[PDB]
Amino acid sequence: XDPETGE
Amino acid sequence: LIYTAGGYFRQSLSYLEAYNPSDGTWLRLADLQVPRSGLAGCVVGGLLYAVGGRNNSPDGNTDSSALDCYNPMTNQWSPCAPMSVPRNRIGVGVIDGHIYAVGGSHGCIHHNSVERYEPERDEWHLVAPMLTRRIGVGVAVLNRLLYAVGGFDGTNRLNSAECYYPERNEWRMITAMNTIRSGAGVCVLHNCIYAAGGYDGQDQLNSVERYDVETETWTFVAPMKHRRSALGITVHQGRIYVLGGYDGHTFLDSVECYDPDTDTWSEVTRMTSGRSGVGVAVT
């Protein structure tokens, strides 16, 4: 979730 | 060798793995005690350290205050005293065999806080805070100066960078990068501070750029051909390796290799599994 990390 | 501790592929990872490019294969070792993603890895006096991160699991999402220590011929993790605060998406640098823990988040709080660890002593000591709150900050060491590069203050992604002078215990802003970068891979190659990939608030980036201290100048080099943020990064062979990360749709297993003297990127391997947010370091 952070779109930088995808989690 | 090229290790990758932690990471995230649908949950925070315990994996600890090696990769050498001279043999093209991986060595697996003692799983992390606590699963971790958004950690950073370093090497001090041979021992591979794991700093901050968080355990994002089906049952919780705990930011990690913890520093843990791996011994390559003891092959045991042992806890080294926790940090001031938990630091997800931390950045770490090594000066003088001492570890600086930079920024990161705890819940809503985006840290400017910085603190230093002492491997002979097993202690953390608060130091001077950054000028900017930074998570996903990339950290580098040049001429025993500590650079905090890029990141996210909670509202804006950052192309700014700032320098820590240890013997004056100060932060001063330097020239900003050409690209805004959060969760980029930041390392030192030749004597340029490299910043590879990241996320600018819209797209993952395949572009790469390097800082030259003498001219205070950032210059773009050949881009990877897979955009990626939350990647691991290290230099082996005088060559750049970037490890996994996220591209907006997939958790990359691609490992790319940048040759500086030809300024070309080339795939070296695919990871055992796609993952993001690992900590990398070599001993």
Domain-wise residue ranges, chain B: 1-283
Experimental technique, in short, is X-ray
CA-based nearest residue to B189, from B150, B153, B221: B221
Give the separation between CA B109 and CA B95, rounded to whole angstroms: 27
Q: Label residue B72 left, alpha or beta by phi (over 0 means left) and psi (-120 to 50 means alpha).
A: alpha
User: For strand B77-80 and strand B91-95, is the pairing parallel, antiparallel, or unpaired?
Assistant: unpaired
CA–CA min distance B71, chain A (Å): 28
Beta bridge partners of B232: B243
Would you state the structure tokens that stand for residue B177, as one six-digit string?
Answer: 């990068």
Residue B113, helix vs strand vs coil: coil
Give the separation between CA B205 and CA B242, rounded to whole angstroms: 13
Q: Cα B131 to chain center, whole Å?
A: 20
Beta bridge partners of B254: B270
**Tokens 């950290």, residue?**
B139
CA–CA min distance A5, chain B (Å): 5
CA-based nearest residue to B231, from B209, B206, B211: B206
Q: Which residues contact B251 (CB under 8 A, 6 or more apart)?
A: A6, B8, B9, B244, B245, B274, B275, B276
Question: Phi first, then psi: what are they for B15, rounded to 5°?
Answer: -50, 140
A–B: how many Cβ contacts below 8 A? Answer: 40
Selected for mutation to probe chain A from B199, B205, B243 (highest A CB count within 10 Å) is B199
Residues in chain B: 283
Question: Phi first, then psi: what are they for B231, rounded to 5°?
Answer: -85, 150
Is-contact B243 B187, C-beta < 8 A? Answer: no
E strand segments, B82-225: 91-95, 98-102, 105-106, 109-110, 114-117, 124-126, 138-142, 145-149, 161-165, 170-173, 185-189, 192-196, 208-212, 217-221
Is-contact B114 B100, C-beta < 8 A? Answer: yes
- Inter-chain contact B199–A7, Cβ cutoff 8 Å? no
Give the separation between CA B209 and CA B59, rounded to whole angstroms: 39
Resolution value (Å, 1 decimal)? 2.2
Cα B79 to Cα B18, B70, B75, B125, B154, distances in angstroms: 22, 9, 13, 17, 30
Give the separation between CA B52 and CA B140, rounded to whole angstroms: 17
CA–CA min distance A2, chain B (Å): 10
